[PDB]
Each structure stands twice: as C-alpha cells, then as structure tokens.
From a paper:
GatD has sequence similarities to the catalytic domains of glutamine amidotransferases, while MurT is similar in sequence to the substrate-binding domains of Mur ligases. Together, these two proteins catalyze the amidation of α-D-isoglutamic acid of cell wall precursor stem peptides in an ATP-dependent reaction. In order to provide insight into the overall organization of this complex and to facilitate an understanding of the amidation mechanism, we have determined the crystal structure of the GatD/MurT complex. We find that the two proteins assemble into a curved, boomerang-shaped structure, with GatD docking to the C-terminal domain of MurT.
The native structure of the GatD/MurT complex was solved at a resolution of 2.04 Å using single isomorphous replacement with anomalous scattering (SIRAS). The refined structure has excellent statistics and includes all residues of the expressed proteins with the exception of MurT residues 1–35, 195–196 and 434–437. These regions are poorly visible in the electron density maps and therefore likely have multiple conformations and increased mobility. The GatD/MurT heterodimer adopts a boomerang-shaped conformation, with GatD packing against the C-terminal domain of MurT. Extensive interactions between GatD and MurT establish a large, continuous interface that buries a total surface area of 940 Å2 from solvent (calculated with PISA28). Instead, GatD-H189 is shifted towards the heterodimer interface, where it contacts an aspartic acid (D349) of MurT, thus establishing a possible alternative catalytic triad (GatD-C94, GatD-H189, MurT-D349) involving residues from both GatD and MurT. The close proximity of the side chains of GatD-C94 and GatD-H189 (3.7 Å) and GatD-His189 and MurT-D349 (3.1 Å) as well as their relative orientation suggest that these three residues might indeed function as a proton relay system in catalysis. The crystal structure of GatD bound to MurT establishes an initial framework for probing the function of this enzyme complex and for developing strategies to intervene with amidation. The two proteins assemble into an elongated complex, with a large open space separating GatD from the middle domain of MurT. The refined model retains the overall characteristics of the crystal structure, but it has a more compact conformation with a closest distance between GatD and the MurT middle domain, measured at the top of the structure, of 22 Å instead of 32 Å. These experiments show that, while the conformation of the unliganded GatD/MurT complex is indeed open and elongated as observed in the crystal structure, the complex can breathe somewhat in solution. The almost linear arrangement between the two MurT domains appears to be unique to MurT as all other known conformations of this two-domain segment are more closed in Mur ligases.
Author numbering:
A (entry chain A): 1 to 246
B (entry chain B): 38 to 134, 140 to 194, 197 to 433
The structure:
Amino acid sequence: MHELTIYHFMSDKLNLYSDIGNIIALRQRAKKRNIKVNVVEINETEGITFDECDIFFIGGGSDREQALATKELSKIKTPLKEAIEDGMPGLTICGGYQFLGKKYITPDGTELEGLGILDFYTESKTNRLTGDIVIESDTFGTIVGFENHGGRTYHDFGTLGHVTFGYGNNDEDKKEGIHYKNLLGTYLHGPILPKNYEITDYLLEKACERKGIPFEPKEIDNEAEIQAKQVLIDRANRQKKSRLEH
Amino acid sequence: DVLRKLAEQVDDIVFISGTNGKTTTSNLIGHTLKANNIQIIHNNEGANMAAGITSAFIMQSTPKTKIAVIEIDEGSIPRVLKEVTPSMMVFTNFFRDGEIDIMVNNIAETISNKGIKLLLNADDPFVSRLKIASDTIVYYGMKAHAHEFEQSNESRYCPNCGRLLQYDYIHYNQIGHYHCQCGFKREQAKYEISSFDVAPFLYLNINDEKYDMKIAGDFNAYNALAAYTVLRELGLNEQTIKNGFETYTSDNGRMQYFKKERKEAMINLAKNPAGMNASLSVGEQLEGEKVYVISLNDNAADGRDTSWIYDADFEKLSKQQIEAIIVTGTRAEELQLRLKLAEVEVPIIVERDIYKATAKTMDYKGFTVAIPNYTSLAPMLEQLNRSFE
Ligand SMILES: [Mg+2]
Ligand SMILES: [Zn+2]
C-alpha cells in the first residue's frame, strides 16, 4: 500500500495537544487518498538520516523544552538544512518555528540560540499578540486559527499569507508564519491543520510528488472544515465592524 | 432562648457532622424521609452554623414536623448544644486537611452523658474515639476488601494511649481496620458495606441488600452508609430506604441523573482532556444505546483555545452504541470537525443554541449523555431540569 513516513521530532514534552491534532489531520486527509501514514517519533537524534523521511514535524514546548530540543536537534543541523534545501516538506509550530532561526530573545533580554537553519530572529515582549487570526494565502486559501504569543519574529522570507484580522509574525507586517521551499512555520493554534486542509494537502501532495506516488482524488469533502472556519471568519468580521463603528 | 422551645416540640432531632460528607449524608436522609411524606425540618450546606440552624428551626417548624435533620459544622457543636440536645448524632469522618485530636476531645466533652445515641464510623479512629461520650453507640463501617480505593501515608497515634496505631487493613489513609494493644480498635459494625462498585453510579451491598444508587464517587459510599444507619435507627426498613436511595441525585451537574418515564439522562461537566475522557467512558458503562449532547463554549472562563479537544479520546465513541451526537455551544463546529477526524460514524447534529440542543435529546429513546464545558453547564442544566419536570 502507498505510504508516507512522518518524522515527529521531540514529541517528549509535557503537553502536545498541537502535535497530536496536526498528526491526526495528516493521517485522515491521506487516508481519504488511500495513503497510509507512518509516524516515527524521534527523541534521540544521533545518526538520524532523512532518507526514510517524507514529511517532518517540530512542535512547540516551554522555553526549557525548546532549548533542550534545540540542543538535540543541533546534532543533525546539517542534514536537516540539506533536507530542507532539497525541498523536504515540514511543519513547525511556535517554538519549533522560532528556533529554526538564529536566536530567540526573551522579554528579560536573555538570548537563546536556535538552529540557524534560516537567518532570522525572534524578540519576545510581555504583551502578547492574542486573538482570532484570519489569513488570505494564494497557496493555502483562507487560513483561520488562534494566536497567542509574546514572540515577534522578523524574517525576510515568504510567509503563509496576508493577515486580514490579527497580527501574525509581529506587530507591524500583517503577515503570518514562514513558507520557505516546502518548509512551513506558524504561530497558529487549533491546532492549525484540522480546519486548514489546504495546508495538510500541500504537505501530503509535495511528499507524494517527491516520492513518485499518486495523490488522488485531489478534491474531497471539506464541508466540516469549511463550517468550522466560517465561525471564526464571521466572528472576525463582527469584530471589525465594531471597530470601524467606533 | 427560642430555639430550645422549638426543638422540644420535635421528637427526633438528628445532627450530622464530621469534616466531610455532611451535605450528601444529610440530603440522603432528608430526601428519603420526604419521599415517604414525612414532614421534617432540614437545613442546608450554607446554614450549618448556630445562626443558620436557629433560622432553619424558626422558618420550618410546623405542628406536623416531628423530625429535624440538621447538618452542623463541627466547630459549632458546643455553641449549639447549649440549646438543643439531639436524639441522635451521626459522625462521618475527621480529616486534618495534632489538631484533630483537640477538636475531637472538645466534641466529646460537649456531648457526654446527655443520652444521645451516637452513630460512629468504626473505620475512622478519630470518630470512634467519641465512644467515651455516650453509653448508646451504633457502629457502621466497611468490610476489608469491599473496594480498592485510589490510595494515598503516615503513622497516626492511638487516641487512647499514645502508641502508634497498628492497622490490620487500610481502606485509605487513616480509614481502616485498626487495633491497639490497649484495647482501642475498629469495632464490629451493625451496618456494614461488604462490597460496592461505581459503574457508573454507586452500587452498594449493605447487610446483604443491594442499593442501586444514582450518585457517584467512591467517597460517597461512606456517606450513603452513614445516611442508611440514621434511617434504620429511626426505624425505616430496608425497602423504604431502598426506594429513597434509588432516586436521590446530585444537583450540581456532576454525574447528575434525570428520569421521566422511560427516558433517562445524565450530565457531567468536562472542560479538559482528563475530564472529557472520563465523561466519554461513562456512556460505555451504561446499558443500551446512547444519545450525546456535547457543548464547547469558548467564553473567557472556558479559555479561547479549544485545541485540547484533540487530546481527548473521541475515537473511543466508536465502541459505543450511539444513536446520534448533538454538538453545541459557540464552538460546536470545532466538535463536529473533531468527531469527523475521530472517524466517529454516527449522525452528528450541529445546534449552536445550548437550550435547543439539550431539548432535542428528549426526542431519542436512548440514554442521554450530556457533557458541557464550564460556561455551557448552567444553560444545559437549566434545560435538562425544565425538560424533566
Ligand atoms: Mg474506586
Ligand atoms: Zn492505644
């Protein structure tokens, strides 16, 4: 049977609600395309290669967990970079996204080192960017979720799209996340994939193309996903009219 | 001076005290008496000190009320017993949360040589210490291995001689079958639970009769037996108690049961993954098919992040006999989608209005399992009360 392997990095954390739902969403959209998903949890990285990897995933944890995860991930920084440069699809969430960069600065000014896969940095404040977020993307259609992060990320790469409601990476850009080759990074909760099937299908379709297996049928039932998105789109719209009428 | 004259007009006055379980014990007694059309005086959990008890006697005394059922804060026992002598007093337990020792001594001095019938938990050594305070003692308790309690661990002192208390068997913590070389020991019980389970409600074996209840919680077995003991000592027989016990239910939306003819429902608050997994596993202990109503609000007190529902085990619903799942609250669609991703293949109905969603369950002959998160609870419980009148 056609199969895709997901490398789930650093799943040893106190909580992984975001992690699990994203994995569920990928498994189920692939199953509808007659593709079985194999999840490999990787917490010891020594001698790990990306030859058996189709998609990787790095979630977020506490600042302690993230610093530990980064020290372990740095033992394979060079294969990961080469994998990404080769087009390896990947999804990274919050701290997993931030620590692909060069540094993460805490509110109290402490500089934490990231992997340096990409040349950017993140600066956190005490006042958080929090609320509903609605993004309009050409690749991922309408992306919807919840953001709640102190970190402001400043990078010069492509993103998941323009933010029509909420903040995204920082206070000013009105752009969310990162999209570099097939590597995705985001601050969105929900977790991001259950409602945002175009993102899920993106990662699976790039993986199928790279492996030489079909991704079919391309168009399936998205009604439940659409109805869940529409609740936040409508609420976001109600919230805008309230400010314009203020 | 008035409480005294009111209390003298009541033949039987039952006081309920101890540190835990007072309200459930009290409510079980009062519910069972009223279900036999006995007129009673009865206070409540917000009125168990001197002032509130006095108010209960003034507000509720009539010429017909011949029993008072009074829960009383353990600290209030001396002040109140300067005015009222109960005919019997049941004590549930004393937990420290050597401070228990002093308080128990003060209670013993207060009730001594007053002719009060004491109903003592034989399994609690600090309750049993009250045997010195009366010549009329009734013991209740639980047989060893009646249940394997969750379990938790220190050495306690014999209230009579100051030795470390030896235990032969521990129910939990200080509660168990203890025996000191001075003679102080877990006494033989007149009313005993030989066995019980919770699946999902309390099912008790008391003196070789089965009591199929409608409340839950392992801790509530002792409260039910404390209530049982009072009622036997008032002269009610096993069948009359069984009738009341079989219909008592909680009123806070935690494992709360409802019934109207052949239609049954229960509601259990769940607002995080552990609570949801527990609520979903209740349905599978329930016989026959089920209908679910599950509510997910995202108001300030709920939190705005609904991601935790992906850590709940909604997949397990595929192992149950379920007619339909109604999803409701402001994030009802998140639940629909979670169930789609869980591959739970049963009719799913989106009805965001919690009152309309809850009423809808009355259209199904299955056992309703109603599961709200925090700000969903009050509207869902209100509708269930309305629907089951
Ligand atoms: Mg138990
Ligand atoms: Zn002793």
